[PDB]
RNA sequence: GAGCCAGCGAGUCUAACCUUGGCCGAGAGGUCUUGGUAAUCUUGUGAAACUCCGUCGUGCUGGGGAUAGAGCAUUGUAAUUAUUGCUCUUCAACGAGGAAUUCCUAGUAAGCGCAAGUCAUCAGCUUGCGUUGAUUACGUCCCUGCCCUUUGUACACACCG
């Protein structure tokens, strides 16, 4: 049963489902000195998932914390309030 | 009256001219007309191959049959719309008259 | 808008119909992982439980997912309509079943087995292991097996 | 009787044509107002005529397109093809010659086809291939 | 000026007389609502489930406002989409026609829409009427 | 328990009737009796009802030979052999109860399986 | 014996035919002339069809 | 979920084809009427990709839907080696593919559907038609074919001589 490829899997890292007082936080003291906020970043830095990412940024649009450029769907573009 | 005559041809230069003869023998007799509506031209296709076995390169053909139809409404007492159609009937143009 | 801090009773792991139903997504895909419920069946029992259907699997209360488990295991009798169940109008029983989890494996064994049992075509194709819906085998799942 | 003109653009299927007469100045599509045509990019592509000259030319006609046939985006380029021309006509009749001659350079400088229509049409398709250039697949053994 | 339908985006005026519709509670809903798919060709129930007939119901409005007159083999074909055929290539298939022809006798009871001559469903002089009271409502909503 | 077709038992089935097994049958039996009233089931029937007198208990029945694979294994025909055409033999099958709702097709098989050796 | 030529043909290929020619493959019934593909090619001039394109 | 736009075409009478509209049904379908021998009616063939808002959140995953089990319908004298359609359930390989190799120079390639042909029923096929629409080149004989010139020939059913 040859094959022809190698087939490596990868990491596969466990980014947060449920938000909490750790996370909860640190998503509010660190959105500031981000330049540009959007969906991934926040996946990125924060691991939390697209769910959590989505919520959270239409969170804290009306209270304040980040200002949006661009509020089409599947792409949200956010600068940061200095 | 309200007579109405449909000209279904193929050929087009016969049925032009029989329909010309209708609407300028209408004119010696001074009879008010819609001139003639031509319809769309339709088209009948019919692609074959051209090979009688299955063999060679599928080079297919298409076969098409043009049908030109047109109708003139004319408004007639009886002596006219018999003598227009009597006349002016030429071979491959199908004329065919209906009333009101 | 709405943040929500969850809390310690959260579970990454659930038991419903002895299957180690994964926490972390959304109620109906999880329950999809027990077999005999499908994403249709799963909507529609979590609707007709009155669950919040946007709640993750982990954090559910205790007495809402034994509803729910009611409610998948006597569909009909709580306003399902039954022709939504996949083993309906039974073959010795005559009732609308919907087998769950291990029914689902057995009793597709035991139907296969009259099949077998009476020698019909279908049951002598499985018993060689080649198709049964009428597939051409000329070329295709040549190395199934 | 009123000043009014007739014109049309076109695009591949798609034709729009536009009654442009003398009013107060409301420029509507299908019955609705320019600012609605759903497709929100090229909705700033069909403001461009206007756009371009200015909107003081907008102000004392009022312009209604009907837009039938083609596909979405082909819908979009008719319609600018018809305000652009209907425009040009309206001042070619009542309006003299020097604001014609405006109007119809700053539009032929900025984009040619909305003024003439695109002259690119549908290649017809040959049997032994998907397409009008592509063949099916070639085999030898 | 005499707003109308046409002079709002199509979007946001449904979502609004959808949204009119929820607090008037008056629509006389199926009741095989959130069990049914709504077409043939769908994969899934309605997401937003707790309305959707009410979606439906102001999407329906709109349409008799623009047209002449539908009936229920229209509205399928316009609510119809692709069908995936597993491995095979897709096509175009019809929405349940239940849904439709439901959700035309349910708004038939709130007066919007009346039948027609010629056939089909017309909108109603009360459907003329109101219809152009939520636009001047919707429209000044970011003005 | 023995055999119930889909909660009708046998002391009904064996001799209830024809034409209320099939209220109880699926969409395909019934629709063949939705359409249909030919005389070749007829046939075949009194033919079964004659190879039924001739066997005592503790004989099976002659088998009784039949081209037509198509016919639903009806409640009457339990307990008989029916020698089935296969397109050139006579296939030997016993009607059992459990067999009920099906064609006779299904039990004379027209191919021999291949082997490759 | 009433059996001979009994089995149905309202439908299907044994049901139709070339007018010309009595066979049952390649039938052309667009327009209803019903002539098999090699007789119609034979017959497609004088019938009226041509090619143009 | 909401918006929402084509073109090529086919269609019954001494037959029952294209089917609007009303009603029943989750569906597929059923039933009562109607229009059409057709620029008139189906039919604006309200096609799909697409567009706008939402749930998903790198997980063989809500990717993929093969292979199986139960029912409900439709065509047909008949559907079992499931005709086809619908519902529910089961939910496999596959993480972009070695040596090889095909087609293509603008409304073209490619994506996306629709009509027609075969057709009682059945399209993953073909013939056409529209919809959305690129990159690259505007060369050369390097490879592969074909043609020509010069040349040698003891070949001429002609190098398989
Ligand atoms: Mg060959
Ligand atoms: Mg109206
Ligand atoms: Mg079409
Ligand atoms: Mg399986
Ligand atoms: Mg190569
Ligand atoms: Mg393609
Ligand atoms: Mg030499
Ligand atoms: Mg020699
Ligand atoms: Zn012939």
Known sequence: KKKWSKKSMKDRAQHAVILDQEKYDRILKEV?????????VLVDRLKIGGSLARIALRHLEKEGIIKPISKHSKQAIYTRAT | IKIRITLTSTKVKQLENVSSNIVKNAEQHNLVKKGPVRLPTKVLKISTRKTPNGEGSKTWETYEMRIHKRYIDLEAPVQIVKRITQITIEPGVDVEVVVA | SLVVQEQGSFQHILRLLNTNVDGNIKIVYALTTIKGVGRRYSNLVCKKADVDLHKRAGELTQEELERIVQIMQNPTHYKIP???????????????????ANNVESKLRDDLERLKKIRAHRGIRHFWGLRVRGQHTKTTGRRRA | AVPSVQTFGKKKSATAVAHVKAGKGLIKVNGSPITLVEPEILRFKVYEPLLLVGLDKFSNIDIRVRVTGGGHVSQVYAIRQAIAKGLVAYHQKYVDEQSKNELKKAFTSYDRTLLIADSRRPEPKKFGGKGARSRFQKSYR | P???????????????????????????????????????????PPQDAEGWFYKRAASVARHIYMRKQVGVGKLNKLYGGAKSRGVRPYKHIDASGSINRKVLQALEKIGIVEISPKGGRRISENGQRDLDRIAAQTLEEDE | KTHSYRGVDLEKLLEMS????????????RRRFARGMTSKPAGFMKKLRAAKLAAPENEKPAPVRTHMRNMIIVPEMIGSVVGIYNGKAFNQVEIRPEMLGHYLGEFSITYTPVRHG | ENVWFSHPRRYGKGSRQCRVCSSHTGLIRKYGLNICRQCFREKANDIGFNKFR
């Not at chain 1, 500031?32 to 991934?40: A, G, L, N």
């Not at chain 5, 519709?21 to 709504?38: A, F, M």
């Not at chain 6, 024809?18 to 039996?29: C, G, I, M, W």
């Open chain 5, 2 to 44: 005499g707003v109308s339908v046409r002079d709002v985006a199509a979007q946001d005026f449904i979502n609004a007389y959808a949204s009119f519709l929820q607090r008037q509670g008056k629509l006389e809903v199926p009741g095989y609502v959130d069990i049914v798919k709504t077409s043939s060709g769908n994969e899934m």
């Open chain 3, 82 to 100: 039954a022709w939504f169940l996949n083993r309906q109008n039974d073959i010795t029983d005559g009732k609308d079943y919907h087998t769950l």
């Open chain 1, 32 to 40: 500031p000195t981000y330049r540009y906020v959007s969906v991934s």
């Open chain 6, 18 to 29: 024809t034409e209320d097994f099939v209220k109880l049958a699926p969409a395909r039996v």
